[PDB]
Symmetry: D2
Subunit: 375 residues, 4 copies
């Protein structure tokens, strides 16, 4: 049936995403020294200040203030004219610290479930709305940092409404792009530049018609942004972090958490499964639901929803997942080789659909395709 | 096979933050129903930080509201981990003082996407797992406060796992209930009281079988809780707040936001739309997506999904939605009569399924059914 | 012998905190003159924390008062190290309902007991015409002159943070001259040190220090560490009540330990030091001593001071036994008697929080309206 | 006639702050004796904020130091108003990496006072000395189980009467102490008199005239940071001489010894104490003047209040000969680069005769070098 579907993303300068990146920068700095550390780092940013809090158990010694200032500086807040300055904002630490047979048989601590999702409607096997929303704010940051549009400032949001028909994309119905900018540029010039340097190189021409609506800084000037007059907190962008609303989400933020937190690592594993099923050609689109029982390691149930797109029977998919992936809480950590400082890169522009992340590798695809008996 | 949802009591640190954010909201709306409020709370060992931005004529004492909220939750002694009377309360709220000929045509305050959902698998038209998860922790607080089990303490968590078959409920596979308690209670007595006074009054006997597992405090003594050794933030329970994983989410938090914020009010309106479609008998379950562009009053998209359970063509449903509901941002407010101090009640035990909330009324169901030509 | 006193401008981080604390006090007293206020401020890079306890009916916006105060001091850009418009302001003030004890707990409010124990000193000397020690007097005037030329457009490139030191040479108890002068001032990036030193010399130092006391031997040090572009709370920390000697007599006289700023007049740490200055100054203006130091002390809950002591360093012109009598006769040093004697229940305290609480003769504790009564009572003509 | 000084116990909120500031200093100095430290603490209902600036190679856990300090002081329960185990601890310390030194000139036109008098055995003014001993005794009988219902927060004040520089008696004593709910005021007053006041104050100074104000406003159950702020550097007269000597300004706690405000003040005490211990005077205020860029003090005034046993100008020359008062020389003279400062942050920096600036090891040298 014909319908619209919308997703959004936000730049690395958005205050919630600032907090995510600081949490994962702290996490990465600890993991570099202590790969087995327990970290639950929650950040709060607002006018003039960063508060980094939470709980860690580690042998690592890290300078929270330096990590914080370096992270905000890299994002681009370096002057009070932008609303925020990495060099002169307040940084407060409130982190409680503590000192540090078959480990893979560790059972789950909760009744829980995890969702994964993939679809061959894009090259990265992600839903088109979240993919192109991500790409729009990532492009905003790129042309900001490389000097193409030097008047851009870090804070930006995007939103894309796709039209579907019979489950395939027909085009883009509406685009929102709001970006922070310096005082000197006028809105008409800004809108033309955003169209030419951000929107047009990112969105396929075939999907843009004369009916497409473009809302580029629709309320006009956007000089002050980031944390200034606007709070950011770790874990308040969990839908832009994942699938943009296209898939179900069981709850649980990612950033600031070490891989032992099932909320993060099991979600990564569930994406890994779904992406490899679709890359194998076993379905065009796939939502996986992994259920865990308190005190047992293997998932208690694995449901593979294929939305009628399956190329083999649905029971065969469940069995293939049982055979080729280790979805035990600690086994998936080993499968994905997660005990490394790789998380700051995940904390803006999406945890899924990205290049080099281990849960985005399609290295079980051909094995699954063979095992299911097709070519 | 299996589906699990969880809930947390008013004493969970994330929910403490939601309740403080909405108590501030309600205190302001009592004096100034048109106030703009964006209140974000951070709680952890010994402290509450209440931050954000308000535009109002109201005069409120944030510290008093905060201590009162924590006192009502029940944290009143350091032995519990947290004490309303002696914790630190910091305020970082920026205050400003207070556009269309027809206020119904006011543009949205932000972009974003919002989902609503309804299913006839329970009488309140909610998914069963989140419904009974909520009622368990709600019942823990009720018997804690009314004197029945006075040795209970505020922090608690529930998990209910349902078994499905042919898409219908077959029974409850597992129930977890963890509750905080005073040092004098032994676990055996605790488990028996919880089972007698909390679980059995709440879960339907028809869904309890020989295969149903019960886990009461599976990790033993639970004496300190809440913010102690932990950290709670507003808007980190958005799946608990809504449908428990059964339906999708647009990502926006609810608590601390006045009804001009479409993250909250349009999610309420999408629940109202979906619930009225299911109550009309036009679908067995229905999910609504809406989205907005900042400065634009008409939604950038409306999508209705009925999972093949629709009783009239999907195209007719979308038309009925556009005919009978005003989803413009200020249309939402007037449709649901939202400018009242009603929001602290929503900040624990779920925003949906409690049928005295305005977005829970099924007062358009008969109109829809009549317009659809159904008898 | 030599004697040095120092002062700091309104832009020094400790004084920023004193000023915010008294700006909050004044805004409250504007609405509720009987309010109880104990406001303590902490400033450091990027943030202000305003804490304490108030009992008042007033409704004030702590964050707005704080940003306005910082903006007036002049911190408005990250280039300076601190920006009123974008720093963080955290409020941690606990509020209580009344605004004293409703109807006071004494039939005669003059008989109310002290709110705390403690000791307080006051001092006066006829070394200067405002009856203050010279070194702190000229130290204050230097940094006050810095802020004046910065704000009135004379030297717009100055920035808020600044510090002065003045060393006087004494001989036989008399001023012979100024031995050394130190003046460090924050400035914008484009001014070079040589233009800065000459500008400070011509516009700040020479207009303020008496030419008679400056000689070929007087040493002048303008920005002895050179470049001074970032300052204030940046890379530093300011706290209410950490400048209690610059607030009073610059080391020339003793101190009882209590801070002034952020305290309403029911706090004897503040009001009894003001009253002791008023006593000592009226004794010296009366010609009863060339210099005079007063100590008072209180017990919490007790209205009569636990001790009054009058020290005149051998300069008294009548027997000291008579002086102590005159003090008991002409001044009401009970806690609330202090308030009524000096008319303290008014929003006048933010002006005291930089450039010194004493020597500025429009303040009520600087009036010498008892001097002639004292002289007449002592039998002097 | 009368002179009054006060002191406060280790549980008073300002002294809690001083103690946390110097506990952080001590932990840094144990790993890095040359560290630069300027640690400012703010304490209030439910929270400790530890702020400031350090340059050091040391790695310390600010939260653990803070909780350990508050626990030892005795705040361990919300009933007392404050709990080491569950209060908030926030850190905001800026950290820099490490980057003839005895000829270092002063950085400021400075003045430093030191004082001593033989009116007590520790060569301190009597009002501050006995004020300290009262609150220190309060803490001792709280901690050793003698009066276990005492709680940490207490203040003392003592008014002495003088005749011609000599003590004649004590006129007034204030002792206010926090306590548990269950004890009545009458029993508290009797217990405080018998166990705190009478063992500390010499009986020959107490008469029928002496006024005793013991918890004069009654119940004192809530205390410490609860409902009233504590900040580092807000007890600088308690820390020094109780108001008897002049003070040029500048707090001690949280500052490493390279801060002249602290170490030059210690050096001035050391000089004054030895002069009196040598018998060159009975009481003695020393005023040390520094010029910027100059190491040796540019002026040393030795005020003796007419009690000198030797020509007053000899005293200055004896000080020059026997003491190294250059800014970094005095640090060597007093051997200051050691973690000794948390103990100084309650009950006074002067008067306790194990600290280095309280040794009278130059008294015999000064006495021999003079006529005596
Ligand atoms: K957490
Ligand atoms: K400092
Ligand atoms: K205070
Ligand atoms: Mg947000
Ligand atoms: Mg969770
Ligand atoms: Mg949480
Ligand atoms: Mg939002
Ligand atoms: Mg200072
Ligand atoms: Mg000072
Ligand atoms: Mg005081
Ligand atoms: Mg104090």
């Amino acid at each position: 049936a014909k319908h619209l579907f919308t997703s959004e993303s936000v730049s690395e300068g958005h205050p919630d995403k600032i907090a995510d990146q600081i949490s994962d920068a702290v996490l990465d700095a600890i993991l570099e020294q202590d790969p087995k550390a327990r970290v639950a780092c929650e950040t709060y940013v607002k006018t003039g200040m960063v508060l980094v809090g939470g709980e860690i158990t580690t042998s690592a010694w890290v300078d929270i203030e330096e990590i914080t200032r370096n992270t905000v500086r890299e994002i681009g807040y370096v002057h009070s004219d932008m609303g925020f300055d990495a060099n002169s904002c307040a940084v407060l630490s409130a982190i409680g610290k503590q000192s540090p047979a078959d480990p893979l048989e560790q059972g789950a601590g909760d009744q829980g479930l995890m969702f994964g999702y993939a679809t061959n409607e894009t090259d990265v096997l992600m839903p088109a709305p979240i993919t192109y929303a991500h790409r729009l704010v990532q492009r905003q940051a790129e042309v900001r940092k490389n000097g193409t549009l030097p008047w851009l400032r870090p804070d930006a949001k995007s939103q894309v409404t796709f039209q579907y028909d019979d489950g395939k994309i027909v085009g883009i119905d509406a685009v929102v792009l709001s970006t922070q900018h310096s005082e000197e540029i006028d809105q008409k010039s800004l809108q033309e530049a955003v169209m030419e340097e951000i929107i047009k190189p990112i969105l396929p021409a075939e999907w843009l018609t004369s009916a497409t609506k473009f809302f580029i800084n629709p309320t006009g000037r956007f000089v002050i942004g980031g944390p200034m007059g606007d709070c950011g907190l770790t874990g308040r962008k969990i839908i832009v972090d994942t699938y943009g609303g296209m898939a179900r989400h069981g709850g649980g933020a990612f950033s600031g958490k070490d891989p032992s937190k099932v909320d993060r690592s099991a979600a990564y594993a569930a994406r890994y499964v779904a992406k490899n099923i679709v890359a194998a050609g076993l379905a065009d689109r796939c939502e996986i639901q992994v259920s865990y029982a308190i005190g047992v390691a293997e998932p208690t149930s694995i449901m593979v929803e294929t939305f009628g797109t399956e190329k083999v029977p649905s029971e065969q998919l469940t069995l293939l997942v049982r055979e080729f992936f280790d979805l035990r809480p600690y086994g998936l950590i080993q499968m994905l080789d997660l005990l490394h400082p790789i998380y700051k890169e995940t904390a803006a522009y999406g945890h899924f659909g990205r290049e080099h992340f281990p849960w985005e590798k399609t290295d079980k695809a051909q094995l699954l395709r063979d095992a299911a008996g097709l070519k």
